């Protein structure tokens, strides 16, 4: 344990990972139009609670 009141504990002992590949941009011309047509054409409104675009479940 070391001690109760040592600052930066979970910041210090956490693991370290790196980044990934660079993403692109269309200044929202299709960046938000993709989620628009995902919510409109692709995802149907199911009678229930909700169905989000980021729902990875």
């Amino acid at each position: 344990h070391g001690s109760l009141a040592r600052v930066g504990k979970v910041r210090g002992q956490t693991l370290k990972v790196a980044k990934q590949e660079k993403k692109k941009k269309r200044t929202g011309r299709a960046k938000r139009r993709m989620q628009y047509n995902r919510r409109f054409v692709n995802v149907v409104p199911t009678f229930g609670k909700k169905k989000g675009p980021n729902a990875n479940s």
Binding site: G28, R32, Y36
Partner: peptide, 15 residues
């Protein structure tokens, strides 16, 4: 947000 994004996408606006 829905018709604002619709107008932006349909009329080719920046923001």
């Amino acid at each position: 947000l829905d018709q604002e994004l619709k107008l932006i996408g349909e009329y080719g606006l920046r923001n």
